[PDB]
A paper describes a structure:
Post-transcriptional exonucleolytic processing of U6 is directed by U6 biogenesis protein 1 (Usb1), a 3′–5′ exonuclease belonging to the 2H phosphodiesterase superfamily of enzymes. The highly conserved U6 snRNA coordinates magnesium ions in the active site that are required for splicing catalysis. We determined the 1.8 Å crystal structure of the catalytic domain of yUsb1, and a 1.4 Å co-crystal structure of hUsb1 bound to the substrate analog uridine 5′-monophosphate (5′ UMP). Here, we have demonstrated that two members of the 2H phosphodiesterase superfamily, yUsb1 and hUsb1, are mechanistically distinct, yet are involved in the same step of U6 biogenesis in their respective organisms.
Residues 107–115 could not be modeled in our structure and are presumed to be disordered. Despite low sequence identity (<20%), the structure of yUsb1 is strikingly homologous to that of human Usb111, with nearly superimposable active sites (root mean square deviation for H/S in active site=0.3 Å). NE2 of H231 is 2.8 Å from the sulfate ion, while H133 is farther away (4 Å). Our crystal structure reveals that residues 73–76 form the start of a β-strand and make several intramolecular contacts that are likely important for folding. In yeast, this position is a phenylalanine (F78) which cannot form an analogous hydrogen bond. Indeed, mutating F78 to alanine causes a slow growth phenotype in vivo and a >300-fold reduction in the rate of processing in vitro. Yeast Usb1 catalyzes two distinct chemical reactions: (1) exonucleolytic removal of a terminal uridine (“first step”) and (2) cyclic phosphodiesterase (CPDase) ring opening to leave a noncyclic phosphate (“second step”).
Author numbering: 73 to 106, 116 to 290
The structure:
């Protein structure tokens, strides 16, 4: 019906990292079980698939012109804030995140707040400003909070209304157990050279500098 977008960083994990993400997923599910998860970085034919960090929810633009202004203002905001490439640090301990339409659960890795703070802080006002300029003035609910930034690495197969209802309480229970049970000793990070704004047709890559 409309002209949608959403904004993200992309990660193309190497086979070395695939192996680590697979271990994380297996050990989480071991700890959980005493629901199944499919990896998001492997396709159904067994090929690599990119991961991402979502910086916004879905952005509904009623006109193609408004979405265009958004994308221009993203680029302008990046140029004026002098954004250059940086590495983004990713936590090795996962938790559950609810999908945007709330019927799916993902196993995700937090984008850790403290070591990325200086790198990530500018994007909030850059996005907020591009959103307001393009007609979305109620932007607060659309920009992902720093504490919710994450990379989904698996999708829960076949959840349950009850399990979906109580995912946050499951997170409390599992978070405690993961610290007692599991020892995820991986140094996860990736280079961010650009930011993407999706469109149905194709994803617009906006280079930094």
């Amino acid at each position: 019906r409309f002209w949608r977008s959403f904004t993200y960083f992309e990660w193309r994990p190497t086979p070395a990292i695939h192996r680590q993400l697979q271990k994380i997923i297996c050990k989480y599910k071991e700890t959980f079980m005493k629901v199944d998860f499919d990896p998001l970085f492997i396709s159904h034919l067994g090929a690599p698939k990119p991961l991402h960090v979502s910086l916004t929810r879905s952005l509904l633009f009623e006109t193609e012109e408004q979405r265009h202004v958004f994308i221009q203002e993203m680029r302008n905001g990046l140029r004026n804030n002098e954004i250059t490439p940086f590495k983004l640090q990713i936590c090795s301990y996962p938790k559950l995140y609810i999908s945007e339409r709330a019927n799916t659960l993902y196993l995700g890795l937090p984008v850790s707040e403290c070591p990325n703070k200086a790198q990530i802080s500018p994007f909030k006002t850059i996005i907020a400003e591009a959103l307001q300029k393009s007609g979305i003035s109620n932007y607060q609910d659309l920009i992902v909070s720093r504490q919710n930034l994450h990379v989904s690495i698996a999708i829960a197969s076949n959840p349950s209304k009850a399990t979906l209802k109580r995912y946050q309480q499951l997170n409390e229970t599992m978070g405690a157990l993961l610290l007692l049970n599991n020892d995820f000793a991986y140094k996860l990070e990736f280079l961010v050279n650009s930011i993407y704004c999706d469109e149905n047709r194709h994803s617009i890559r906006i280079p930094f500098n």
